[PDB]
């Protein structure tokens, strides 16, 4: 014969429909739901996502890319025009180095 | 394992052996006339000692019938293509939309079908009206404190609908 509590039987369950059947996301103030739908589907997509996609679709050449294409064209035309072999090894001058010898 | 009893019975077990043997012999034997011959042969094989009196010798021979049945069954029997364990096996379960739905809508599509929803509304009135006292009094009144059976008696005394009828009557068509 004991109860150990005083409070109400919980959870008293809630149903977001059946009082405002035109409902988007949150609670039953009827105008501000339309304000929410307006602000997220305009100011989240129609000014953010597709516009940022067209922003990042082309932009300055990230990591030197077409710059390196045209520089590769010019330098390979150079090294094939002078007879010397392209991409010579020993990337620094062996006269401009001093080994600690044996 | 069965709803309305605890054991099946001896006659039921003989009948289950007879059904399974008949089904497996169907599945074994094509051309259907040699099958009809072998089925009458099986019927004669059960006619050879149909009139036995020793109960324990009868259930012994039923056991050995299961032995040579399990040795002599069919590999992949002709399951019915409407049956459980089959090619259909709720094939059109795609459109078994449960009927607690169809009212969780917007009143545009409720305005599209007005008469069926008004008639469902009076179905729901007919459910809610005769629900608590009559049905739960017949459930809590007539059986023993341990019910000890799954089957339910109908509303047999005088009046209204049989008890707990909703999710038994209101079901899909099983072929829409």
């Amino acid at each position: 014969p004991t109860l150990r509590w005083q409070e109400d039987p919980e959870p008293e369950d809630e149903n977001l429909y059946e009082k405002n059947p035109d409902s988007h996301g949150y609670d039953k103030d009827p105008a501000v739901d339309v304000w929410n739908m307006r602000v997220v589907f305009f100011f989240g997509f129609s000014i953010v996502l597709v516009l940022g996609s067209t922003f990042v679709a082309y932009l300055p050449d990230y990591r030197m890319q077409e710059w390196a294409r045209r520089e590769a064209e010019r330098l390979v035309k150079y090294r094939e025009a002078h007879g010397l072999p392209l991409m010579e090894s020993n990337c620094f001058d062996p006269s401009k180095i001093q080994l600690p010898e044996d | 394992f069965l709803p309305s009893a605890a054991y099946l019975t001896h006659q039921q077990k003989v009948l289950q052996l007879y059904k399974r043997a008949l089904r497996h012999l169907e599945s074994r034997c094509v051309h259907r006339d040699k099958y009809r011959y072998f089925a009458c042969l099986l019927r004669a094989r059960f006619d050879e000692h149909k009139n036995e009196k020793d109960m324990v010798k009868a259930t012994q021979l039923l056991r050995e019938a299961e032995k040579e049945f399990w040795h002599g069954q069919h590999p992949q029997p002709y399951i019915f293509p409407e049956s459980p364990g089959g090619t259909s096996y709720e094939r059109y379960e795609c459109y078994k939309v449960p009927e607690w739905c169809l009212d969780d809508w917007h009143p545009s599509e409720k305005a599209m079908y007005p008469d069926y929803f008004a008639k469902r509304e009076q179905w729901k009135k007919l459910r809610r009206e005769s629900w608590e006292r009559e049905v739960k009094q017949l459930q809590e009144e007539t059986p023993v404190g341990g019910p000890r059976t799954e089957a339910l008696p109908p509303a047999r005394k005088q009046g209204d609908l049989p008890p707990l009828w909703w999710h038994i009557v209101t079901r899909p068509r099983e072929r829409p």
Binding site: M37, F41, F42, F45, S46, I47, V50, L51, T54, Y58, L59, P60, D61, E66 | Y95, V97, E99, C101, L102, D104, W105, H106, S108, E109, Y113, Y116, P176
Partner: protein
């Protein structure tokens, strides 16, 4: 009179969401695509000059499409 009754679950919220999504993407789906069309149909992209003598370049005038 031959047809039966069928039970779809709910089409309202589906069609509302998809109608709002296409309408609120195409609300700037038209001016952005037509504007980038007008940029690459009017203004000219670029050409391939070398360095003019005694003239330092800008940090722009490097790019193919001029919105970049």
């Amino acid at each position: 009179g031959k047809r039966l009754f069928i039970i779809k679950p709910s089409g309202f919220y589906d069609k509302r969401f998809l109608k709002l999504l296409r309408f609120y993407i195409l609300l700037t789906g038209i001016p952005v695509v037509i504007g980038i069309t007008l940029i690459n149909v009017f203004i000219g992209e670029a050409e391939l000059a070398e360095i003019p003598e005694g003239y330092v370049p800008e940090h722009w005038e490097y790019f193919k499409h001029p919105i970049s």
